[PDB]
Amino acid sequence: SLRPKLSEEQQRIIAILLDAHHKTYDPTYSDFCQFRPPVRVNDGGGSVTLELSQLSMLPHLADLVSYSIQKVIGFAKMIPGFRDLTSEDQIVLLKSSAIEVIMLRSNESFTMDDMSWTCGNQDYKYRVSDVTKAGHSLELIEPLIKFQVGLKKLNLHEEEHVLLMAICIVSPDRPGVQDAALIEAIQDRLSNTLQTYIRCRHPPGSHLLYAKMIQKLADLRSLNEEHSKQYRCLSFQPECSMKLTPLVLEVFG
Numbered sequence: 744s745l746r747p748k749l750s751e752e753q754q755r756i757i758a759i760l761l762d763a764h765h766k767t768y769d770p771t772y773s774d775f776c777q778f779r780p781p782v783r784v785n786d787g788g789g790s791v792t793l794e795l796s797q798l799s800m801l802p803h804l805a806d807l808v809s810y811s812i813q814k815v816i817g818f819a820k821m822i823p824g825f826r827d828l829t830s831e832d833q834i835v836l837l838k839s840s841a842i843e844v845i846m847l848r849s850n851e852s853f854t855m856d857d858m859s860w861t862c863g864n865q866d867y868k869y870r871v872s873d874v875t876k877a878g879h880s881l882e883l884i885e886p887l888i889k890f891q892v893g894l895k896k897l898n899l900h901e902e903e904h905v906l907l908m909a910i911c912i913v914s915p916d917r918p919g920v921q922d923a924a925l926i927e928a929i930q931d932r933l934s935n936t937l938q939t940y941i942r943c944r945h946p947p948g949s950h951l952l953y954a955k956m957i958q959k960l961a962d963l964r965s966l967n968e969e970h971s972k973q974y975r976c977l978s979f980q981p982e983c984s985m986k987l988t989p990l991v992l993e994v995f996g
């Protein structure tokens with residue numbers, strides 16, 4: 744019902760988050776030529792044995808994810824209040840939310856035209872098949888694609904998008920957090936900002952949108968769990984560590 748205006752502090756938070764995102768997410772994907780090249784081995788049958796023996800797309804996707812994790816760390820450090828947390832809690836939040844933020848931010852390159860993540864040209868277009876060539880199964884990829892479409896259909900403003908990622912990162916319910924109270928205070932400030940933005944930018948479905956956005960955070964926890972399970976299996980493959988990166992190994996190890 745009530746549609747209060749954004750306070751000066753809330754306007755600053757949003758401006759800060761938009762700027763942080765613009766500085767950490769390159770919409771031209773110009774750094775992709777620096778990643779190990781993608782390699783697509785003939786695997787129309789989706790052979791688990793073949794995929795594991797080759798892991799042809801893993802070096803490229805691992806570099807992409809590693810690169811993205813570095814960008815997410817940068818984005819997080821710019822979130823108002825994040826610096827107020829102990830170094831220990833910052834690392835805990837980053838490691839636990841990393842894959843979720845990547846899934847969220849990837850929605851920008853995701854396109855419903857052909858259900859793929861398109862980053863410039865055809866060499867950097869990723870479909871279900873490309874992800875299976877990295878060692879993952881449909882048990883993760885299919886729900887991920889469904890998640891991307893659902894997120895796409897929310898038609899989030901960039902403001903809502905960056906606030907959602909910030910809220911995802913600053914979650915007090917991450918195992919291992921020490922000062923959950925402080926984290927919750929920061930998250931509440933971000934959540935209140937999002938709720939307020941939605942209300943004065945969306946007429947009362949403002950309430951339906953916020954609820955739908957919060958539901959996405961829950962969906963991400965499940966995707967996070969499945970990814971962790973699959974990463975474990977992948978780690979068992981001999982010589983897999985060389986196809987990953989030090990950052991990836993530590994974050995998901």
Ligand SMILES: C=C1/C(=C\C=C2/CCC[C@]3(C)[C@@H]([C@H](C)CCCC(C)(C)O)CC[C@@H]23)C[C@@H](O)[C@H](OCCC)[C@@H]1O
Nearest residue numbers: 768769770807808811845846848849852860869874974
């Ligand atoms: C990374 C990013 C992108 C796409 C994300 C994808 C497409 C291919 C497979 C991935 C990467 C999924 C798999 C399941 C994770 C695999 C990780 C592993 C191998 C460690 O287990 C998670 C998200 C999926 C591209 C661009 O929008 C951003 O890119 C930055 C450019 C601005 C974003 O930051």
